[PDB]
Design a protein around this ligand. Structure first.
Ligand code: HEM
Length: 173
């Protein structure tokens, strides 16, 4: 039940092409040991350290953003420390993050969204869990874990992240 939604200007991009463009614009928020403040922590909708969405905007341009949707919880200092886990269904990418407190986060100039990812990870997997790898990678402007996960999904259709959005649309829709 994987789905893709995209601005039609991306029809002829591969998934890999689009993610490379987004990652080059987003940069890296440097959410690392010695470097974490409110500026680069992002935030959850629905709670302080858990909720139905997690979102963050670029510290390089202040506008490029992603929103992850699902049921997500971050352990902060509980073991295994600094682990994001749960059920991740959707990822939306674009410019202009809005909302997040009394209403859900959304994106004002959206490019692409993936839904039906059905990725699931347990607290005890710590940093090797697929949800943590995907989202922490995106915060660091590294799309590798997401690309590996999407290849796992797309193999059922005989596609991969080198397929264009219009190719994926014809296969899943
Ligand atoms: C939900 C998405 C998040 C993920 C995937 C994530 C992941 C991580 C990772 C992997 C580290 C360790 C970096 C290293 O060892 O170099 C870390 C550190 C840290 N994170 Fe997060 N984090 C997230 C959100 C947050 C939030 C919302 C807060 C608090 C508002 C937070 C507070 C911290 C702190 C205080 C540190 C430790 C910095 C230090 O030891 O100097 N993180 N996080």
């Amino acid at each position: 039940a994987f789905s893709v939604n995209y601005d039609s200007s991306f029809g002829g991009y591969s998934i890999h092409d689009y993610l490379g463009q987004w990652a080059s614009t987003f940069g890296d928020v440097n959410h690392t040991n010695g470097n974490v403040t409110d500026a680069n922590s992002g935030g959850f909708y629905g709670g302080s350290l858990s909720g139905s969405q997690y979102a963050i905007s670029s510290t390089a341009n202040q506008v490029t953003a992603f929103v992850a949707g699902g049921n997500l919880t971050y352990t902060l200092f509980n073991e295994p420390a600094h682990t994001l886990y749960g059920q991740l269904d959707s990822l939306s990418f674009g410019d202009g993050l809005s909302g997040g407190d009394t209403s859900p986060y959304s994106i004002q100039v959206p490019d692409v969204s993936f839904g039906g990812l059905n990725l699931s990870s347990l607290q005890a997997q710590g940093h090797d869990g697929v949800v943590h790898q995907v989202v922490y990678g995106l915060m660091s402007g590294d799309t590798g874990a997401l690309e590996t996960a999407l290849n796992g999904i797309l193999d059922d259709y005989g596609l991969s992240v080198n397929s264009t959005f219009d190719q994926v649309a014809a296969a899943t829709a």
